[PDB]
Amino acid sequence: AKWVCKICGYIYDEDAGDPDNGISPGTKFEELPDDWVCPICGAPKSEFEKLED
Ligand SMILES: [Fe+3]
């Protein structure tokens, strides 16, 4: 699934993960650590919104 950072537009794609910041491809958004943040703007997980209806 993909989740967008409502502040900057960054897209956390679960299939891509976030390797540079310790997240391997395939990591679900809910499993990301509670203090993981958007690699672009630094927003907390609370500011992301899943891209699903
Ligand atoms: Fe962001």
> Domain containing 28 — which CATH number?
2.20.28.10
User: How many angstroms is the resolution?
Assistant: 1.8
Q: Which of 51, 52, 7 is nearest to 39 (CA)?
A: 7
Which conformational region is residue 14 in: left (phi greater than 0), alpha (psi within -120 to 50 degrees), or beta? alpha
What is the distance of C-alpha 16 from the center of its chain? 10
Quick check: 12 and 23 in contact, CB under 8 A?
Answer: no
3-state secondary structure of 19: helix
Q: Which residues contact 10 (CB under 8 A, 6 or more apart)?
A: 4, 38, 39, 40, 41
Burial class from Cβ neighbours inside 10 Å (0-12, 13-18, 19+) for residue 31 reads exposed
In total, how many domains does the chain have? 1
Ligand 1 geometric centre to CA of 27 (Å):
18
Q: List binding-site positions for Fe cation.
A: 5, 8, 38, 41
- Report the alpha-carbon angle 30-36-39, nearest 5: 115
> In degrees to the nearest 10, what's the CA dihedral of 19, 32, 14, 52?
-150
Range of the domain at 4: 1-53
